[PDB]
Each structure stands twice: as structure tokens, then as C-alpha cells.
Design a binder for this molecule. Structure first.
Ligand SMILES: N[C@@H](CCC(=O)O)C(=O)O
Ligand SMILES: N[C@@H](CCC(=O)O)C(=O)O
Ligand code: NA
Ligand code: NA
Lengths: 239, 238
């Protein structure tokens, strides 16, 4: 239900937690985050419960790394539990997701035949294993995500990262909002601009069907056929 | 003329240079910056001429480090030259300064007598040598600055760092404006809030006579008797 992501030189865990504090929708049930450092070391922490519980856990095990994604969940598929909380993983592929993957069943079956173990009951987890699958077929994360997204049906927003290549985040808007926040030598993404105001006031709103490749220094947006599209940045005057 | 400073986890050179670009409208003859990394390695680059010239040189000497100060100068003491541009140094003490130190002559002679060599013709350089002097007497950078400031007369603002302890910046407002910009796990300072808008919208204005010690995580403000004062932070989108 709430997504925040960041790709920066500085540690982003505190920015992600502050973003989640700004995305605490009535009835959400769990929260989690994953950060990866420059050497590809990933730390993921999830909790059934409130962002404050996650924040307290993060205080104990300080999470270093300039690339990360975080999520508050409002469960639709799978009961609230830490196992089902986001980020979900498929080895090096880490995903957070808002909305629903309608065709999760057939997809889950295909991936199971490809040798993938599902550990959660969520529709989300199919996104992770599928991008893992596509990436195995060769190409960059952007290319794999371009192949993946058409296979997914439903109303969703997702941000994906590959812990082996922590210099890029991929994001796709396909029935649920996402907005990019532009920083200086760092970039952010959230499902609501309100999450990002502490660190930037300049935004690019993704449009329906947009897939964005975000690095510390560049934002490149494409549609599903892989065509590059131009989206305007705007300065927000909200406090 | 324009001052920008930053103390962050990320490299700050780009933020400093952008801050200077935002200050060019005030006019200036030279500009410079200094950044220090976590290990105390200081890189200083100065140019007679435009910020764009400095930014170009920075592109060849990519400056790494999370603590730094930068300045555009409008010369009052000493002709425009790279030697007279700030930041000025005294070994590990590095200073940028707006305004004038009216009593620079007596202090310069005093510090010359004390063994310092002045490389520049600026009043500014006395600040660097004086803080270096006071620090030799013992204490923290904050303590040394508290002892230095009362010796200076003039209408000025200054930001000071010690490359040996890159986790703190000291700033003193004594007749020329300075504003702190509050970030998340980083803090900034400038002579004009316009310099800081790209990175934050929350500010604390230093009041006359305030001496601030700024770290990545905290801002502690004192008066000249060393008393802690509380200043209000305000949000200001321009
Ligand atoms: N359907 C996903 C995401 C729900 C949401 O948008 O929070 C889940 O149940 O985990
Ligand atoms: N008096 C100092 C500072 C001038 C300024 O405020 O730019 C100098 O001449 O370098
Ligand atoms: Na869709
Ligand atoms: Na004064």
C-alpha cells in the first residue's frame, strides 16, 4: 500500500523509514525494507506490525547502503505475517509492490516448474521470481523488466532491484501511482509525493504504463514497447 | 560575498558548487571550495574568475568528501587573485569569510610576532591563523572559536573547519547573515537561503553574536559567553 525507494550515495534507511511514516494508511498491517550497499550486500528487515516496530528493529541492526526500497502492506493475498510482508526476494531480485497481480496462479505454477520455491502466499512473490527468470534469459534489469511486465495482469505499481547491481532501480506503474523525486546526485521514488518532501520538492509523475529506470544520476522512462518517453519534472509547493 | 557549507555522509562538492551558482547574482571576482573526507584528506581548489571556471576545474579533480565550505569573494582586502581567494588555510584550519575584520592589522602583526606566515593580503587570513593559535592552546574547535571571535572586530560571518576533525563545522555570525539548512542526517550552512533550496527547505537563522557548531546530526548554538541558546527552525519555500 505505501512504497518508497531511494538510490543515493548516502545511507538511505532513515529516509525510507521516514517515508513509510508518511504512508501509514488506515488498516495497513506490516512493513519492511531492504537496502543494498555498493558491494551488493543486502539487508532486509520486515515486521508484522507498525512502522514504529520496524524502526525500532532497524535501530538495533543499523542498515548501511545507498540503494533501498521499503513498503507498508495492506494484505490482499496471504494473511498478515512477516513471511508475507514485502520486500519479497528471488535470490538477488527484491521487489515491493502495491496492488494485485490478477494472474498470479498460472504464473506461480510456471515458475514452480522452472524450479522456483515459493515461500509466501502473496501474489507479489511471483513478480520477484519472474524477473529472476527473465534476467536468467539474458540482458539488463531494464530489459528483463520490459519482458516481465506484459506477462503481469492487474492494477499495480512495483519497484524492483537486483542486489548484484545496486546502481539501478526499475519501477513500473500499471494501475497504481508512482512518482519519482529528483535529488542532487540521488533519486527517489514513492507511491505518494508526500513521502518524499523531506528530501526533495521536484517530482516526475509516472503515467500509466510507464517503466522507469532510475539511477543516482539519471531517470529514463519507457513504455511497454521499450520506447523512450518524455515526462516533465515539476516543483511541488506542498509543505 | 557568498558562503555555502555542508556536512554530510555523501560527497558535497556538487552541492557546494550549485550553492555558489545560486549566489553569483550578488557579484564576485573569485571563488573557491575545500572538501575534507572521513580520513582528514583536504582538497582545496580556488580560481580567479567565475564559478563556471571553478566547476570545470572540479570536473578534472573530482573532490571527494562529506564536509566542505565554499565561497565567492568580493575583494575588499587584497587584489583579486587566486592567492587571495578563499577558503584560506592555516595548516588544518580552513576558513571562508564574508565581510571585513576591521582590526586585521593589529592581529596580523600579533600573529606574525607569534610565528605565522601570511601568504595572502586578506583580512580573512588572520581568522585562520588566529583559530589555529587558539586551538594550540588546547580544547575543541568550538572552544577555540569562542576564544577567537571576541578578538575580531568587524561586520562579518565566517565558517571554519579543522580538516583533522571533519565531523564538525563552526560558524559565527557577527554582522553578516548566516542561515543553517537542516537535512536528514546532514546539515548545511549558507549566507543566503537561496543557495540551499535544492537540498532543504527547513532553516535556522543565526542571530547576531551566535556561534554554531554543526554536525551531520546536530546543530548546537551558543553565545560568546558559551551559553547554549535555542533558535527556531522555519520552513521556507521560495
Ligand atoms: N497484493 C500484495 C500487495 C497489497 C498492497 O498493495 O499492499 C499483498 O497482498 O502483499
Ligand atoms: N574581506 C574579505 C572578504 C570579502 C567578502 O565578503 O567577499 C576579502 O577581501 O577576501
Ligand atoms: Na496493470
Ligand atoms: Na561583528
Amino acid at each position: 500500500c505505501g512504497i518508497v525507494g531511494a538510490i543515493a550515495q548516502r545511507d538511505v534507511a532513515e529516509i525510507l523509514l521516514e517515508g513509510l511514516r508518511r504512508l501509514e494508511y488506515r488498516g495497513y498491517d506490516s512493513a519492511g525494507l531492504a537496502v543494498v550497499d555498493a558491494e551488493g550486500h543486502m539487508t532486509r528487515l520486515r515486521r508484522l506490525g507498525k512502522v514504529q516496530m520496524l524502526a525500532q528493529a532497524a535501530e538495533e541492526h543499523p542498515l548501511h547502503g545507498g540503494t533501498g526500497i521499503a513498503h507498508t502492506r495492506w494484505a490482499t493475498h496471504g494473511e498478515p505475517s512477516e513471511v508475507n510482508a514485502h520486500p519479497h526476494v528471488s535470490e538477488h531480485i527484491v521487489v515491493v509492490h502495491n496492488g494485485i497481480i490478477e494472474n498470479h496462479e498460472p504464473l506461480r505454477e510456471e515458475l514452480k516448474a522452472r524450479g522456483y520455491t515459493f515461500v509466501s502466499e502473496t501474489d507479489t512473490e511471483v513478480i520477484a521470481h519472474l524477473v529472476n527468470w527473465e534476467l536468467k534469459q539474458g540482458g539488463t534489469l531494464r530489459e528483463a523488466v520490459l519482458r516481465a511486465i506484459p506477462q503481469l495482469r492487474g492494477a499495480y505499481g512495483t519497484v524492483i532491484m537486483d542486489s548484484r547491481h545496486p546502481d539501478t532501480l526499475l519501477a513500473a506503474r500499471s494501475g497504481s501511482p508512482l512518482v519519482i523525486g529528483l535529488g542532487m546526485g540521488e533519486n527517489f521514488i514513492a507511491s505518494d509525493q508526500l513521502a518524499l518532501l523531506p528530501v526533495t520538492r521536484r517530482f516526475i509523475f509516472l503515467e500509466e504504463g510507464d517503466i522507469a529506470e532510475i539511477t543516482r544520476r539519471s531517470v529514463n522512462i519507457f513504455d511497454k514497447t521499450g520506447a523512450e518517453v518524455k515526462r516533465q519534472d515539476i516543483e511541488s509547493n506542498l509543505q
